[PDB]
């Protein structure tokens, strides 16, 4: 199994993509063992990015590695087609799309047309980015089997019965969970890994949870998963998408600038309370020789 | 109270706004009694539009009438501020914004900041576009009071208790329902009216229901409400957002072009089945002398 | 429209039904203008009551009035059949049942059979007690039409569209809402009335809201509705079903004993804290001359 | 890790517990590898049983094995307290209780008081029977810690992060999942086992899944889990609670009578169709030498 990072998109103070900070961040992650990079996902504020900005993220990360899954979805299908086509010249893993978001009660027939249309034009394997809470509809294993063209799926859902069902109906499909709290579980139950936003700021931990599991040292794995669980929670206190920046800078020692409002950055005091929550978990992890002093 | 139409956005074969069909459609809605027009709402596929297209829509409808509320929201706070300020030069009713959509678990603080910010730059009254199902969060009465600067609210929710609470905790606020099926109810329980996608294709009906409720002929108003509900129901089969195009062409007799994929247009078979579903209702509406044979 | 009280079941300290405190309560509710009494409802802890105890409450209230709808449902169908049958010796308004509760994902086919069985054996009209949050399923207008034998429905749901649908699909059916916070609206929109737990402790208020709406004195009907909403909100601090005992003694002046654990009574501190929250409301209610002294 | 059967309560034509069929079923289950027997659970129609019938089920199953967890809860605390005390004389594993069911929006204070009371009176370890979707409320890991006195939890939820959290915050607690579809996952991820309803009719399978996962043959374990998953799906076509009787008679060869209305038994045509849906599976299982022809 693998650990896939839905990479953060660092923005400048004046709301541009800081291509340099993106590259450092991508470089660090590859250095610390991350298998692939998922670009323009939720953790990267993909839905806040223009088609031009989505392409920029690909170009910036393509300098660092070609193990990229390139998210192109949106509510303008022509922008998504143009993006999928422009990836032809990029030797990457595949492209991805989440479902058309916002609009409730969208017909299965219409949703199927959308993903089929991305497959008919894609010059790479096509991954399904399933995130019902964010997009407001579910491409479950049955609908994915009927699309018939996905090479994998990132299932962002608390229900893991739902994630396993993809394998059951598509034995050949790569199945990833999007929950950080299930790295140990995923790795041990026969799935292909985790798209984990927590790997942005603790890639050492998510990678290590994985190893321990494949070594059938599940007891340890859970101990480590649970520490990771506390950090996940610390980030929700103030808004995990904004906390990702503070956490990555705190654990990995470089700046990722700011998010894109209405994803507002944490202020000086929110930053203090967040670090005061994880201060002790950091120490324990240097103790356990998982982080460098 | 008022009927406010969340006006459809017509698209050409080339996926561009059809300015002339928009103006044609806007005229008819004003001439058939609609009080104001909500531009770049859900029914208009607001989220699917660029900021330049959101402004395009305003410029084109202003040609016909200034009784407009201008929706400017999005996931780039800068683009919305720009849009909100550009409205200075239009003598319109207000601007509006849904809460920032897609991203879950957004802090109340971050959500209040997003709206207080728009209020801060706005040269017109600011209206709250509350659509919890489509956006993923609820700017309810307490939070709207906390925000402190809304002139009105459009509450897209089937819980009318939730809607009354706005009037209770904000006595001077205009409180509209976004539910086509409560036009009789809203009018009769002291609320300021409805924002009704259904008024796109049968503005004769939404207006008549409200009038009938004002004259306290509530029994006669429900009878027309339930006929309207059935049309609402029929449009859901193939996707209501697409079907309004068909229905508007069918009941009002001019064409509105295409929706923007992934909001796909009904096909010829789908268009024909919907009409067969509404022929019997149209008959009863002719019978009532609300429509011409 | 009508106000129907879901009458509390008074319990002694020994976990017995206090029949005399009950009769007193019924007498007062009737004397203050309540139209009918709903016995063994949620507010009278029906599901906590045995078949003998339900019948007991019917015998008890029948001593005071015959304007009684008699809930009989349960998870043992032979007990419900018996209660339905035994009601023949009582000249009441009808019987009623919620859907079988607790067990998730019950089949419409089986749910229809449950209710048709009660209709086949019922000596009186049958009322659908629809409470989806409590029973775990929904007997909407479509399933009620299919069942085909309901004289009326009590619809405990935040969604008034859902309630209107019973009228749309069942024009002859008596349609009540079970939402205290919608008494003015229900009355103003052509529905048949409310089943209002808050009429246990403030029947003066609930009846005046109804009357004001019937007179189309809408803003004054809302004024009183919004105070009532504040009492409802106060009751939720410590548990609404237990607070009803404290609130009814406070406003009506006679003590109703205790609820049945695990519906724990409020302790004396809690009782005093809840009364501190409603001293204000009560003061205004005296000023407005809806309550005495 | 263990498989615990939430044993079925078999009823006669006359709606009485068939003590003798329950003992055969009970003996069989233990003998095919079932670890513990959960009595009076959702699958046994717990909420449908009088307290006497809850004690009668214990006395019967106790004649076969002392590996019994004795669920005692209900909406009359005095009955529960007394069912707890009467278990003093049975040398069993422990008692359990779901949360008080039906009544929505109950206070965390009262829910804790409920479980603490049972702990105060219990002569055996107390198990939390957590079933959010049946009871209408959830006792999460956090609350179970507050309550403070649970030896084990049985988490009936399709969300396995929710289940793992009990072990996170309560390391000394036995944590079982209630989902038949996670037997392989639960066993390979370090949790303590499953409360599997489908082990009523295919105990061979649920125990072989478990064995396989313990043996790290995760691929062979999943293939068998996917078989079992289909049987679970087939059981829903008609009412899984009802279908379980048919399926046990089919797979195990002895009839368990009827369920209790309103849990209606399948009729003969429903029996036929259901068997046709699982005939193929019964063949695959005999092919794998898991079942004898």
What quaternary form is this?
homotetramer
- CATH fold field value of chain A: TIM Barrel
**Range of helix content of chain A:** 40-55%
Strand content of chain A: 5-15%
Which class best fits the helix and strand makeup of chain A? Answer: alpha/beta
Strand order of the largest sheet of chain A: 7-6-5-4-3-2-1-8
Tell me the greatest interface: A-B, 37 and 37 residues
PDB class: lyase
Keywords: aldolase, lyase
Assembly: tetrameric
Entry title: Sulfolobus solfataricus 2-keto-3-deoxygluconate aldolase T157V/A198L variant
Description:
Chain A is built from twelve helices and eight strands. Chain A has a single domain, classed as Aldolase class I (TIM Barrel, Alpha-Beta Barrel). In chain A, 56% of the residues are buried. The longest helix of chain A is centred in the C-terminal third of the chain and has 20 residues, at 268-287. Chain A is of the alpha/beta class. An eight-stranded parallel beta sheet of chain A has the order 7-6-5-4-3-2-1-8. Chain A binds chain B through residues 15, 42, 45, 47-48, 75-78, 100-107, 110-111, 113-114, 117, 133-136, 236, 238-242, 260-264, and chain B through 15, 42, 45, 47-48, 75-78, 100-107, 110-111, 113-114, 117, 133-136, 236, 238-242, 260-264.
């Amino acid at each position: 199994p693998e650990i896939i990072t839905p990479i953060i998109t660092p923005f400048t103070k004046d709301n541009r993509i800081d291509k340099e900070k993106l590259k450092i961040h991508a470089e660090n992650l590859i250095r610390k063992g991350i298998d692939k990079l998922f670009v323009n996902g939720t953790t990267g504020l993909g839905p806040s990015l223009s088609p031009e900005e989505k392409l920029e993220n690909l170009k910036a990360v393509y300098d660092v590695t070609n193990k990229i899954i390139f998210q192109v979805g949106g509510l303008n299908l022509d922008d998504a087609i143009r993006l999928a086509k422009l990836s032809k010249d990029f030797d990457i893993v595949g492209i991805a799309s989440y479902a058309p978001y916002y609009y409730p009660r969208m017909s299965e027939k219409h949703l199927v047309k959308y993903f089929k249309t991305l497959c008919e034009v894609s010059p790479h394997p096509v991954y399904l980015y399933n995130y019902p809470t964010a997009t407001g509809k579910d491409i479950d294993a049955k609908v994915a089997k009927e699309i018939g063209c996905f090479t994998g799926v990132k299932d962002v859902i608390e229900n893991i019965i739902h994630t396993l069902d993809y394998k059951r109906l598509n034995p050949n499909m790569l199945v990833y969970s999007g929950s950080d709290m299930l790295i140990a579980t995923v790795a041990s139950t026969g799935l292909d890994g985790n798209v984990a936003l927590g790997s942005n700021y603790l890639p050492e931990v998510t990678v290590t949870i994985k190893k321990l599991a494949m070594e059938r040292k599940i007891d340890e794995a859970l101990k480590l998963q649970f520490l990771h669980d506390e950090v996940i929670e610390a980030s929700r206190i103030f808004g995990s998408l904004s906390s990702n920046y503070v956490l990555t800078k705190y654990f990995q020692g470089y700046d990722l600038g700011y998010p894109r409002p209405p994803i507002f950055p944490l202020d000086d005091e929110e930053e203090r309370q967040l670090i005061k929550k994880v201060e002790g978990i950091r120490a324990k992890l240097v103790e356990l020789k998982i982080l460098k002093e």
